[PDB]
Amino acid sequence: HDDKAATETFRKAATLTDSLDPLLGTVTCLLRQGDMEAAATQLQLCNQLQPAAQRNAELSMLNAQLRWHRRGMEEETAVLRYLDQAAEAIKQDVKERAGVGMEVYVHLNAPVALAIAHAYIMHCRNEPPDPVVGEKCGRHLEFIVQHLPACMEAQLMLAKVWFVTGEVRKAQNLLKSTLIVQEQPLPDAFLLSSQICQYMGDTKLACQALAQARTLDFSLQEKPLYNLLLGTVKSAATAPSAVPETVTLYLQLAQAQLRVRDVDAARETLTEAALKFRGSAQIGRVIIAQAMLAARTDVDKSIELLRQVSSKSEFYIAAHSQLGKLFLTHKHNVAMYIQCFQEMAESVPSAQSYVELGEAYTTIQEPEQAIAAYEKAKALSPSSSELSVRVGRALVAAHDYAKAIRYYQDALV
């Protein structure tokens, strides 16, 4: 990282022999320094010098590196292709040069190969599933880890995406096993692991996990991440030179302004960050955070915010999943509640929707409609036998003891 002096060294080395690889070394360090213009111009040259079939590995990175800062949000798919263009190539061009290890690691360039995992994770989700690009993030890491299982740097990104797995028992052991043996890296996975345990319901150890991160240093507090996670169990966000990373920072801000009970500051950072992060593909979560506060401010403004998201957002149905929740204990609506759950049931059909709309019919104590919605939840998925238990419980709660016997016998068949 002697970037400025070695930048001329590449320019000497590129003049000594004009080759694509050391030229891309010049583009890499110019990106760190800020000369995106010289970074973009020579990206064109290396694109023209591209080998026709076996596309060069570091070439696709300098495609993905330059575009990520500005075009990467708009190229969240396109740069991911440029990610895939070399990610499979490093899977393959190294495999083309296997056998003798000297060819393996020279085309590996693990700092480039680990930068793929750095690029992939910020493109991927941060939240566990319910009771593919995430797996695509997860597949390439186990590809990196399998050949050389010792390295903790590749382990930590692997141990991270094990949060997406949903095998919570097998994960939290692996999260614990790798963190205790290897002590040098950052411990923030310890907090995140215990918060998954609290997310399941295992809270007793989560109080002690806070101290475990705190044990090594006070330097964690330079990240405001810890202080919130400290308070979970029991200047920085503005960021001038003094996006999904900032989205996690915005989750920190959201729960902070949840706990502090500040109204004006919460709404002011909602407006400001929503203005700055409107173009992001996550603002729906942001606005429903607004909605989760706007219930204490104005119901109708919250409903308008809920209507400010289209069906292209993955959180949008989640938005409606909480918009229906707006009629749970505050609106106490009946007709509007049934309307909303029908809308989200037809918009994105699933067994779970066919379950929770059934829940809607249990909210209004209509037996037959709850029976029907749970029956089509059973019909939608053969993977609804665990939900078929709930179907049976709802129908016996719906006094249909004559047909309860028949439903149970057929389900047992």
């Binding site: 037996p367 719906a398 003891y401």
Partner: protein
Amino acid sequence: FLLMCQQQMADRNFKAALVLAMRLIEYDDLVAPVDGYSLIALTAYLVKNFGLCSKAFARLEQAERNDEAPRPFADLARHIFMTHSPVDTSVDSVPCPTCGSFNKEWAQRCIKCQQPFNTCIVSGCAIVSEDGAWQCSVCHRKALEAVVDKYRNCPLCHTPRKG
């Protein structure tokens, strides 16, 4: 509602007892639902109708299962549901004065146009015509003429009639 809902059995006109009893659903915070749903199921049985009794028994038994975590309301629910047909009788017998939509006698709003109705203070039926609606000038309540003619005083304030 609770006083005349309970004494309606003494008044022997058990039809209005359900109309009174199905008005305390929104008042579950002030009076615990285990208190009112017992009366709701009791007056549902006494007029031999069902459907609403199924909902009341379901909520009562959910409360009991919350409590234990030997209950006789499960016994009563199962006994009645197996010894009688648990199907709701006719419940839509009043049309909306605005859009003509037939609604529940205990409905606080229209099921179609969503317009609230003032409820009778003694019988509990939603008033559809203001001609047969008597407005009290003291407690600011409304009732029906055919029942308020019998009572010389208001059921709420007992305001004497000026003459």
